[PDB]
Amino acid sequence: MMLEFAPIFIYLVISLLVSLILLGVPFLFSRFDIRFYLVSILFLIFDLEVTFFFPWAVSLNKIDLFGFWSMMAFLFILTIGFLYEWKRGALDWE
Amino acid sequence: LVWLEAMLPLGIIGGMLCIMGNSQYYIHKAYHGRPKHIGHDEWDVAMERRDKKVVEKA
Amino acid sequence: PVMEKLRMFVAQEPVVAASCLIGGVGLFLPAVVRPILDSLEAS
Amino acid sequence: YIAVPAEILGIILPLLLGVAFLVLAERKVMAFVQRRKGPDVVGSFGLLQPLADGLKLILKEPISPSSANFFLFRMAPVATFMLSLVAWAVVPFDYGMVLSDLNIGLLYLFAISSLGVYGIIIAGRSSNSKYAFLGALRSAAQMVSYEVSIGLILITVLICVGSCNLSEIVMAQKQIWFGIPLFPVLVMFFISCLAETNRAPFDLPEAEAELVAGYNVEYSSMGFALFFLGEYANMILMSGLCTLFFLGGWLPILDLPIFKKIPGSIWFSIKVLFFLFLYIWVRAAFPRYRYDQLMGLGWKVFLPLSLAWVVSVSGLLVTFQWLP
Amino acid sequence: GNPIPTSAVLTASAKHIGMRCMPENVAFLKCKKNDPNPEKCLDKGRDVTRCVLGLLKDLHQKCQKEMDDYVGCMYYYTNEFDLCRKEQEAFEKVCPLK
Amino acid sequence: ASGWGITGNKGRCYDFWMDFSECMSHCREPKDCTLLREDYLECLHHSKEFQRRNRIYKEEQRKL
Amino acid sequence: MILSVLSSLALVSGLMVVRAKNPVHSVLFFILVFCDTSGLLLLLGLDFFAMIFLVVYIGAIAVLFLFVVMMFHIQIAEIHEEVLRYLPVSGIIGLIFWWEMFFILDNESIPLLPTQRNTTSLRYTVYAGKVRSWTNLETLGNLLYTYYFVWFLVSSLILLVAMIGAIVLTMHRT
Amino acid sequence: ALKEEKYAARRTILPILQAEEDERFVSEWKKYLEYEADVMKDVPGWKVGENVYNSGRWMPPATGELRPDVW
Amino acid sequence: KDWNTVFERSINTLFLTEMVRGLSLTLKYFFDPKVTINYPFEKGPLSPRFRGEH
Amino acid sequence: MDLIKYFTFSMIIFILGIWGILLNRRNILIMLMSIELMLLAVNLNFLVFSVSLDDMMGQVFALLVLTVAAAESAIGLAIFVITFRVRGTIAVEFINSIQG
Amino acid sequence: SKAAEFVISKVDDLMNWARTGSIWPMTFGLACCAVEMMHTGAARYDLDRFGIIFRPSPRQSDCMIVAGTLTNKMAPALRKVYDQMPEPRWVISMGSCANGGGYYHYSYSVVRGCDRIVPVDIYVPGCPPTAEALLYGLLQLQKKINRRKDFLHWWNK
Ligand SMILES: C[C@@H]1CC[C@@]2(OC1)O[C@H]1C[C@H]3[C@@H]4CC=C5C[C@@H](OCCC(CO[C@H]6O[C@H](CO)[C@@H](O[C@H]7O[C@H](CO)[C@@H](O)[C@H](O)[C@H]7O)[C@H](O)[C@H]6O)CO[C@H]6O[C@H](CO)[C@@H](O[C@H]7O[C@H](CO)[C@@H](O)[C@H](O)[C@H]7O)[C@H](O)[C@H]6O)CC[C@]5(C)[C@H]4CC[C@]3(C)[C@H]1[C@@H]2C
Ligand SMILES: C[C@@H]1CC[C@@]2(OC1)O[C@H]1C[C@H]3[C@@H]4CC=C5C[C@@H](OCCC(CO[C@H]6O[C@H](CO)[C@@H](O[C@H]7O[C@H](CO)[C@@H](O)[C@H](O)[C@H]7O)[C@H](O)[C@H]6O)CO[C@H]6O[C@H](CO)[C@@H](O[C@H]7O[C@H](CO)[C@@H](O)[C@H](O)[C@H]7O)[C@H](O)[C@H]6O)CC[C@]5(C)[C@H]4CC[C@]3(C)[C@H]1[C@@H]2C
Ligand SMILES: CCCCCCCCCCCCCCCCCC(=O)O[C@@H](COC(=O)CCCCCCCCCCCCCCC)COP(=O)(O)OC[C@H](O)CO
Ligand SMILES: CCCCCCCCCCCCCCCCCCCC(=O)O[C@H](COC(=O)CCCCCCCCCCCCCC)COP(=O)(O)OCCN
C-alpha cells in the first residue's frame, strides 16, 4: 500500500509554508580540480552498490547460498575496482 | 550541583521529543477511534473496507 | 621470509588488516562451516 | 486527513523548540566543561536566550547581495531546512507513534540524506564568492563521502532485520539491542554521523580561523538561521537514528515490569539525549582534522570497515540460518 | 443475538474456526483451486458460512464476557495478537480450543 | 510470458501464455493456435473487452 | 488529473532542461524532472524504484553533473545560439513523432471510457493473494541474485569499466 | 513464529471472506447483466455478457486503472 | 617487532583508546564549580595601586 | 485511460530529449543531458509495462538500465573534462578538426 | 489613540529586549586591547552568559568592537567591514588608541580616533581598559539600545 505517503506530502507542504513565513517576515519591518569529479565517480559507484544491497538484504532468507555467493562475486568485481583506485591515488587528497 | 543548570535545556529537548510522539498519537486516536496500527497491509485495508459494509448494512 | 612482512603490513595498515580479517571470517563461515553443518544434518 | 495537519504541526513545532534549546544546551555544556557559566542572564538560567536570539534574527535586515542568482541564493537555505524537517515524518517515538509508517522507510531516510548536499552546493555557487564556493565544494564532497559508510551500515542493520520499516527495526531488538553485538558498527555510525552533519571534529564550515570560509558566510538574517536550524535538527535526527538502529528505540533496557512502567517515548528521548550530549562532549574534547585527512578517513577507513561488517554479518547469519 | 462477523470477531475466533470448520474450509479451497469463477463455488461457500456462523453463535453462548473482551481488545489493536494475550488466555480457558 | 508476478504470485496472463506455447510446440501451422494467441494478447491489453464496453457506453449516450 | 499535474510539471521542467541559457540551471531543472518521475512511480506502487530514482539520479548522477558544470564556469557566448529558426524543423519532427508515438498504444490498448455508472462494484477481490503480500523490494530481490544473476554480474563489469575509464582519462597524480 | 501465528489466523478465516465476496460479486454481476440487456435492447447481433476469451475461462472484469490495489 | 606489541598498537588505533582520556577529563571539569564572576553584583579583585580614572 | 496517460508522460520526456538534441547545436553538455532524458523515458516505459502486464521482467531490466545510465554519464563527463582540458573551451568550433 | 500607544510601547520593549539579549559583536582585534577583550570572553567574565557571541563574518554581526590602534593603512579595511554589517548595528571604541590615537596620536601613520572612519556609539577608556571595563561598556550599549522606539517612530512617519 502507498497510503502512508500522503502524510509525507502534506508534511512537505506545511514545512515549505513554515520556511516561506520565516524567510519572508524580515522583508516587512575558474580553477577546475579533477579530484571532485573523481570523488563524485566513487560515490556513484558505491551508491549503486548500496542500491543493489537493499533487495539482497531483505531477500537473504529466500535466496540462501546461491544469492549470497552471487552478491559476493558482484562485490569482488567492485572491490577489485576499488583496489585499482586505491593504488592509483584516487583516494589521496594531499 | 551547578551542573544541573545544563540539564534543564536537555530536559526541555527530551520533553519536546515526548510531545512530538504523544500529541500525534492522541490526535490520531481521537479521530480514528483506535490507535494507529503499525504494519497496515493489503489484508488490513481490505478488512476495514469490508467491515464498513458489514457494520453499516446491519 | 614472509612472516614479518605480514607483521609489518599489520603494523602499518591496521584498518585494512582488520577489514580483511572481518570479511574473511564472513566468507570463511559459509564456504567451510556451512557445508559441514549441512553434512552433519544429513547423517 | 483533516486532522493530519494537526499531527504534522505537533511534530514540527516542538522540534523547532527542541532545536532552539539544543543550541542553548550546547552552549551550557561547553561552558561547564570550560569552568564558566554560559547563557544565564537572558531569562532564569538563560532559558530565554533562544527566543531573544531568534527575535534578533527576524528583526535583522536582510542583505541579499547583488548576485545574478537572486532566486537560488534564498532558496538554498529553504531546501536544506525543509529536508531537515521532512525526515521526521517516518521516525517512530513509541509503538504506533509515527506519522508515516513507511515500509521503505530506511531507503527513504537514505534518500533524504543524499538530498541534503544540494542546499550547501547551491549556497556556495549562488553567493558569488570564490571562498564560499570552494568551502561548499569541500563540504559537499565530505558529506557524499561519508554517506557511503552510512548506507553500508544501514545495510548491516537491514540484513539483521529483514525489513526497511523503522518500527520493525525497533521491534526486532526486543531480544537484544543491535548495539551490543554490532558495537564497532555503532561507533562507526556515530563518527560517520558527525562527519555527515559537518560537526566537530569534521566542521570545515566552522574553520574560518583556518582560512577555510564556510558555505554560508554571505548569509544573514533568516537564511543563515535556516541553515543553522537545519544543521541542529539533523544532529537531533542522527541521534534518533543511532537510538533506533542500535539502542532499541523505545524499548526498555531490561524486559522487566519495573522498567515497563515508564513510557517508551521517555526511553527513546533519554537515549537521544545521551547521543546529543556525546555530540557536544566530542566538540568540547578534540581539535579538528584537515579536509584531506578527513577525506582519507572517509574512503580509506570507514568504507572498507563498513563493507567488511556487511560481509561478516551476512555470512554469519546465512551460515547458522539465523536470518529473519 | 448473532455477533456481527466483523474482522475483529473472525480474527479473534480464527483458531476455533480452523479447528472446527476444517473440512468445509479445505473443500472450498479445493473448489476455488479448480475453478476461480465465483458462481461455480457458491454451495461450498454456503457450507463454510454456515459452519462459521454456527461456531460463532456457539462460542458467544458459552463464554459471552471473555469473547466480548477479547474481541474488543482485538478491534482496539487492529487484530494484533501480541497486544491481547491476557484476554486471549481468559477466552481460551473458558472456551477451550479442543 | 515470464510468469513472475509483480506481487509475488503467478503473473495474470501466464496460464494463457503457457497454453499458447504448448499449442505452438506441436502444431506445425501457427493458424491452428490463433485463438489461444489472441486470448494471451487480450489478457495483456483487454482490447476487445474495453471495445465492447465502449460500445455499451456509446449506445447509452445515443439513447439519451 | 493528478497525472495531468505531474505531466505538466515534467513538461515545463524538461523544456527548461533543454532551453535554459545557464547549464547549472539546466542541471537543477533536470533534478525537478526526476522528482516528478518519482511521484509517478509512487502512483504506480513502485516505492523502491521511486526512492532509488532519488538516490541514484538526483543523489549521485545529478551531483556529478553539477560538480562538473559548476567548475567549468561556462560563458554564455560559447554556447549561445538563437533557436527561433529551429521552430519549423522541430515542428515537423515533433508533429510526426507526436502523431505516431503518443498514440501508438491506442489501437492495442483501447481506453475504457468512464461511464455514468459505478463500475467499482464489479471489482473482484481475491483474498488469497493478500495473506502474505510482497513489497516491491522483496519481489525484485527474489529474482536479481538467483534466476537472473548473470545480468547482475555483467552490470558489475560495466561499473568496473566506468571506474577504470574515469581513472585512466582524468587522473593527474600530484 | 509471531508472524506465522498471524498468518495462520488469516488462513482459517479466508474461506468465509472469499465466499462473502463471491456472493457479492455474483449479485452485482447479475444486476450489471440486466443493465446491459436493457441498454443493448434493440441493438442487433448483441449477446449479453459475452465472454471475450475464446477459451471461455473466467476472468474478473478489467478495470482500466493500472494499479488500483495499492491505494 | 613482535606480535603482542603490533596487536596492542592495532587495538589502540582501532579502539581510539587515547581519545577516551580527553573525554574523561573534559567530563571531570563538568561537575566542578565555575570561576565566572556575576558582574555587576560581583567584581574582580584590584589593589590599592590600581591606575584608574585621574 | 491510466495506461495512455502514463505512456504519454514518458513520451513527452523522450520527445523533449530529441528536441534538446535538435535545439542545442552549440551546447554539447545539454546534448548529453538530453540523452539522459531519453534514457529516463525508456526506464519509465519498462516500469509502466511491468505493472500493466503484471510481469517482473520490466523491473529487473529497469534496475540494470539505471546502472548503464550511471556508467554512461561517468564516462561521458570524463570525456567532456579531457576535451575541455585540451582546448580550454567547450565551444563546438574547437571539436570540428576531424572531417571529410 | 489611548490603546495604540500601549501596544506600540510593548512592541518596542520586545524589540529592545531581543536586541539587548542577543548582541553578536565582530571583533576588530588590532593591538593589545584585543587581549583584554579575549579575557572578557574567557571564563572569568564569560560574555557568553550575557548572550554575547562573537561572530567571524560582519554579515552575522550586530556590533563592531574596535580594539586597538587604527593605522592609515588599515582604515579602508575597517570601513569596508563596517559597511557589510546589516542594520541595526553599533560600534564600540575600546582603548585610548581607538578612542583618539592614544600614545600614537602624533604619529604620521595613525588615525587619530576610529570615529573619523566609522560612527561610534560607546567609548571605553583605558590603555587597555580592564576586561571588567569592557563589560561595563557593553552594559552602557544595552542602556543606549533600550532607548530605541523604532516601531513608534515608523508608525508616526
Ligand atoms: C519541560 C516540559 C515538562 C512538561 C512536559 O513537556 C516538557 O513533559 C513532557 C512529558 C510528557 C509525557 C510523556 C509520556 C506520557 C505517557 C502517555 O501515556 C502512555 C501512552 C499510552 C499508550 O502507549 C503505551 O501503549 C503502547 C501499546 O501497548 C505501548 O507499546 C507496547 O507494546 C509494543 C508492541 O508490543 C512494544 O513495542 C512496546 O515496547 C510496549 O511498550 C507503548 O510503549 C506505551 O507507551 C498509554 O496507554 C494507556 O491508555 C489507554 C487509553 O485508551 C488505555 O487503554 C485501555 O483502554 C482501552 C479502551 O477500553 C482498551 O481497549 C485497552 O485494551 C486498554 O489498555 C490504557 O490505560 C493504556 O493502554 C501519556 C502522555 C504522557 C504523560 C506525556 C504527557 C505530556 C508530557 C508530560 C510533556 C509535558 C508537556
Ligand atoms: C524525501 C524527499 C522529499 C520529496 C519526496 O521524496 C523525496 O517526498 C515524496 C512524497 C511524494 C508524494 C507522496 C504522495 C503523493 C500522493 C499521490 O496522490 C494519491 C493519488 C492516488 C490515491 O488517491 C485516492 O485513492 C483511492 C481511489 O483510487 C482513494 O480511496 C477511496 O476509494 C476506494 C475505492 O472506492 C475506497 O475503498 C476507499 O475507502 C476510499 O477512501 C484514496 O482515499 C485516495 O487517496 C490515486 O488516485 C487517483 O487515481 C485514480 C486512478 O487513476 C483516478 O481515477 C480517475 O480515473 C479513473 C479511470 O482511470 C476513473 O474511473 C475515476 O472515476 C477517476 O476519478 C483519480 O485521479 C484518483 O482517484 C500523488 C503523488 C504524491 C503527491 C507524491 C508526489 C512525490 C512526493 C512529493 C515525493 C517527493 C519526491
Ligand atoms: C568482497 C568479497 C569478495 C568475495 C570473493 C570470494 C567469493 C566470490 C564468488 C565465487 C563463486 C562462489 C565461491 C564460493 C564456493 C561455495 C559455493 C557453494 O557453496 O555452492 C552453493 C551454490 O553456490 C552457487 O552456485 C553460486 C555461485 C555464484 C556465482 C559466481 C559467478 C561464477 C561465474 C558466473 C558465470 C556468469 C558470467 C559472469 C558474468 C560477469 C550450494 O548451494 P545449493 O546448490 O545447495 O542451493 C542453492 C542456494 O542455496 C539456494 O538459492
Ligand atoms: C554505550 C556507549 C555507546 C557509545 C556509542 C558511540 C561511541 C562514541 C563514538 C565517538 C568516540 C569519539 C569520536 C571522536 C573520534 C573521531 C576520530 C576517529 C579517527 C579514526 O577513525 O581513526 C581510525 C581508527 O578508528 C576507527 O577505526 C573507528 C572504527 C572502529 C571500529 C572497530 C573495528 C574493529 C573492531 C574489532 C572487532 C572484532 C570483533 C568482531 C570479530 C584509524 O585512523 P587514524 O588515521 O586515526 O590512525 C591513527 C590511530 N592511532
Ligand code: SF4
Ligand atoms: S589603547 Fe593602549 S592597550 Fe589598547 S591598543 Fe592602544 S596602546 Fe595597546
